[model samples]
Target: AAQTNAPWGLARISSTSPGTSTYYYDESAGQGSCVYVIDTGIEASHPEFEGRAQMVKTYYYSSRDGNGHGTHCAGTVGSRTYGVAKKTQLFGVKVLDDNGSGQYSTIIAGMDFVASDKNNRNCPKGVVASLSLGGGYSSSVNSAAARLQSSGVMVAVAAGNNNADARNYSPASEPSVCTVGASDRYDRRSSFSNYGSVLDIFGPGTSILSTWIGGSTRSISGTSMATPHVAGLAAYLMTLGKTTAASACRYIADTANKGDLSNIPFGTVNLLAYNNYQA
Candidate 1:
């Protein structure tokens, strides 16, 4: 079973309830669409997933997520029974193998693979990428982000979980990339929600449920959970009419709602507000 928290986002992953509840389910505007999940990696055998992970690529720089953080994030974005983009395809790129982290070069290499693997192999057509890990804004990462964007691929990265300023990160602050912030159960900024002009959108990041290592489900929290929501929505918006990355970004930006920024200190996003596409 899944739970509908917001008419837009997610919170929990259901249990003992495949067809029973709606705890981890959100509005599936992205039904029938597919996007790539570029994370540590995803556990394909997770029961909640039912062999649902579509592998576009897997780059294992280290093996840190054998405990399952990557798997949970994948479920939140690509799980049919629990993800926001249930109908989407998650392309796992294992950049961090067993170390919980990876070399900057290795991470960049994984991103390069995701961006250019279209005609290579294990890649879907018109692919988009979901990135849950990133450093503070870095020149190398920003350049890579630009390269990916120019290649007709969309990249979404977590705005780090520091609750500081967005200007402090790699893919998050990159102009060509999409930066996502986390929101709490109250739809308020998470205590760790990083802020800055670099942010592109916000999503559910508190008490999020997804697949764990081996065969388990659990609730985890962080901005890492927020990045995929924007990636999924970007895929959905592209399907709706915006084909190019810039167009899709405009749709997201134009549709963003100005919320309690005075307190929340962040921007807003809406799929419907991206009405005009003549830019």
Candidate 2:
């Protein structure tokens, strides 16, 4: 049979504002009341985001746009879709800016702000964080990520787009983070998606169909794109009542399209069993 214009069986859903829509819509979990997006500042005015979407906080840690990299990443991770968690309290931290890059120290500082928001008693509860930004790993950086994990914050990061050795930067490469790789609609690893013996799982990162500025959609590609699918899925899983990174990741794998992970391509990720899922 010929494929239709629709992408994922049905259109991807977005929340009306945070509490307006459920986190997910299909099976058990459909609300994202417990998820928090830590990415670049969203535009906050797209048509798809007119009445919905919330930028609870914005941290301009960087000076400029950072080469639009962060914006692209944001679209993938938390853009408001038709029926998704539209009202979910999605926050933006400008770890990177117009230059398309920022210091690892600055990125870590941003993470600290989100994780410690509770110690400071500012952010909402059950604030799970997803970082699509990274350059390389440092002992100091790893320490901060570990702190977040220890604090009970579920963390998800990109494995890297290098498509080579798993060694990258914090907190993606760190063992404490739910390191994710990129896959396509068919669940094949994107050529540039970095994989290794320790990669936690893969997500829809290859040629993903997502929102663009000015009421449009674009097919951007990268581990960055893939990272958000996992992030969103993690949020959905959390809404189902699993807050730990390990448990959420385990569920994703349990439902993921499993196969011979030894080889790689760009599609949906293989996590569950490659042949079947728990349901």
Candidate 3:
């Protein structure tokens, strides 16, 4: 099928928001859904959030986004302008420091906190864990993500910015996690994106505009940027009663629009094109 023009370019390209007619789906913009960002941190005062963002736990520094990477990812997930699920509840689980680095144990601890639903951050429907950071492969982190998914928390991770195959990276290489690669605004795979069977899907990551710390916004590119779009999309699906991690992943994979991709590899035919939201 030929790709149709989506009303919201990026959201439409990914087929995330309700279509032009709004006749079929009820426009579920992640009303009751919650997405926990396991990254540096989030600027709770960022105007794009209007106080909907919360700092749940921190592994190192204070509950503030000094590096701004986490805030940018959060904006892509829940901000009104750059987000897929504008109304989705946002929470921060700081696993990395101001330098954007953390140990695998810290990340695993953060995932455990989310899975345990400490402080009731978990939504009544379910929680979506958005991880925009990755390093070399770690079996422990991968196992932790799998355990979280088993506990019903949806996990979405970046396939890494390295151009090499992502199977060599942790979390993204984890089969149980929804691994995402990067596609540019032209609907082509980003040169910096790692690809392979580990990638479950591709999303807009090149020069993507999103919120920054201290009440500002900026455009940055990486698999990090692309991960949140899918994370937000997953949260939106949860609002529509697609609560389980497995079910939401199936819906996203099945409903994705493949026509947007150009010369996509045979193994990733279904991994390209971000299409409409149908459950």
Candidate 4:
């Protein structure tokens, strides 16, 4: 009844019930798709990635993965064990510095890099970009995010970890981006997760296990951890021939695991992300 003791987030999305402590996924879940993770760099050599991870573009700096946030998020998106789209090509776009902070210019550059990569035919089909970073509202960042989406990258972003209304943040508040909040194993919204009318779905984030730097692993929590789940879903759906961002978002909502989450803020979407086991 279980595929692997991969992680709770993996099991939660593939099944409809709680306490299903294992993950199940078809071998071709994310084949023929790619994901561009925008954050700190990913340690491309990490065993979890099985060589699927590559540092394609560096914005602020290199050594690629000077920090583990990017590595963690990338693993969550497509690692062989803890990933949602196990076969998706994962490319890292480093925007944040080693201290886990970045400037607006760097972040936007990271996004534009994805768009440029696609145009240059440097990426395969079903392209997705996952961003686990956010801050106060900025018209500039919002415009950049919208442009990136318009450029054909299926964008998935974190709602924020401040516990405030997501509308207060940039990119998260951007209408074109699919914003994700956080849910726990028991289907309760994580206390620190931001929510609002802008949120598109909830993803398992609290105490989730994923790959880290140095060929190790760690359990962490945040809307950051929640976002790549949706990003991975986008890639999986694209492999299923979902050709557009709107279609992917609609499919996720129409097939979401509803009536399962609790403590969802007043204006937040209560639906949790699901894989539909459509394969």
Candidate 5:
């Protein structure tokens, strides 16, 4: 069966398959790890975060999460009910403005800021950067992401919603990042999800519910929603002592649910899974 509120996504991540007994797991609470949402912003006071969430940096505008998208994605990464890591310190890096418009330079700067100790956060174990935003390919952004990964950060990016090949999008197509695509409740790839060899895995993205700004909740859809699922999982693995970004990515790929997507190439990609954990 599914787990709690985020049944589809968490069930897949926690390894409690439908029709099977609900398997319980010890909550890591993301104690030893951290996650950074590089998007619009975050609602720092959202009760789901229990005051553990904060805005670490802002590039072009206020980090109040006026757009709600960033908060929603952050919840999936750290909120108690919808979150994967539950207790990881969630940080918001505001790159996109209130209107959800952002420049490549602004986003690149946001990544660089988080990667460096300029903020004094001291994320020594490295941070999981959940990026739910994407556009046309940008070599500069890709290079920055690679550098972040090299610096020990795990980057989870959304495969665009355009339904085209994900290789055409920045961050998602960027090598060294976990590129996520959307999958529906039935384990089928979301019709609007982009697919290609570049994508690392599929996650629950359709009609997904999570925390929203102003102390509320909402259901939204997109590869953006799916990206946080992977981000949270990556953070959880880090807490378990999988230090390198490459190892986390490898564990996910090796243990994912296979043969779920008929249209996409199977050998290179797999759906996110939680059954691999021995607990």
Candidate 6:
């Protein structure tokens, strides 16, 4: 329940107060849980994965992650290094291409794969999907994501980095998923993070460091980064009986640390996700 030196995002979520630099979590952690990274795919060989991250399906070439976003998201979710659920198995579901772009059809296809794959892993804790990407309103995309949620995979999505109403986006605005906005180390809203009533919580997103390709680490910003913090939390919750998608979203919002974030939009939730760990 103690980390000598932990990433600020991880350290911040486990406690109500900021700046402790310690992240505490359940002993089971992510043992029976699984997080599916639906993005540009992950470099399964990255040491941070410790051989637990695998690419089960892809829409592109190979699973050799070239864009770095998916690997970064994977690390935040459950890589041995920068993860919230440190031991959860990670599966890469590649929808985006090398340029970090994907079509609604591709993404929807990926979601379908995840919905079916969830039963195969047979995770006792549960299965989680982290989608750190979104676009303008699209009924197709939103429906696909909601269907995944309905299939029992807890979903966490990024509230886009456009700095406007998250209601303008697809999956982010989808009520079935847990929409996440971005925050900084100081517990202040990230300037570029989208916010609104659709957002379920805020997460440390600015300058957060995590695993990248080639066995290295990289720091990036966006609701993209923040989304995984919540995704990882969702996976952690699976170990504590928050197994279903709806229940995980409800408990995550209910147990989150309240009134701890600054500069959040008027209608946005004033809660920062708390991992409920004891240090």
**Candidate 5 — which residues are off by over 4 angstroms?**
1-5, 16-23, 122-125, 265-268
> What lDDT is reached at residue 32 by model 1?
44
Pick by TM-score: 3 or 5, better one: 5
The order by descending TM-score is 6, 4, 5, 3, 1, 2
Choose 1 or 6, whichever is better by lDDT: 6
Q: After superposition, how far is residue 254 of candidate 1 from its true place, in Å?
A: 2.4
Query: In candidate 2, what are the lDDT values of residues 149-175, reduced to their tens digit?
Result: 667667777777887756655666677
TM-scores, each model vs. reference: 0.79, 0.75, 0.88, 0.96, 0.91, 0.97
lDDT for every model? 0.63, 0.55, 0.77, 0.86, 0.79, 0.88
Task: Put down candidate 3 lDDT per residue, 175-211, tens digits, no spaces.
Answer: 9888888877666788888888778887778887888
**Tens digits of lDDT, candidate 6, 19-87:** 878788876777778899998989989888888899989998777788999999999998776989888
- On residues 117-207, what C-alpha lDDT tens digit does candidate 1 reach at each position? 7546432324567788868557898788778777777777888898788788887888777778776555467778776777776666767
Q: Give the TM-score of candidate 6.
A: 0.97
Error of 5 at 166 (Å): 0.8
User: Where does candidate 4 clash, by residue pair?
Assistant: none
lDDT of 4 by residue, 1-279 (tens): 235676999999998986787787666768878898999989989988999889888865464787899999999999988789988899888888888999998888888888888665444556889998988899989988888888888899899999889998988999878889999998999999999999989999998899999889999999999999989988887886754555676678678998689898776789899987744
Decreasing lDDT order of the candidates: 6, 4, 5, 3, 1, 2
| Model 2 per-residue lDDT at 193 | 79
Best model number under TM-score: 6
Specify the highest-lDDT model's number. 6
Global local distance difference test of model 3? 0.77
**Model 5 pairs in collision:** 13-274, 29-87
Candidate 3, TM-score vs. the true structure?
A: 0.88
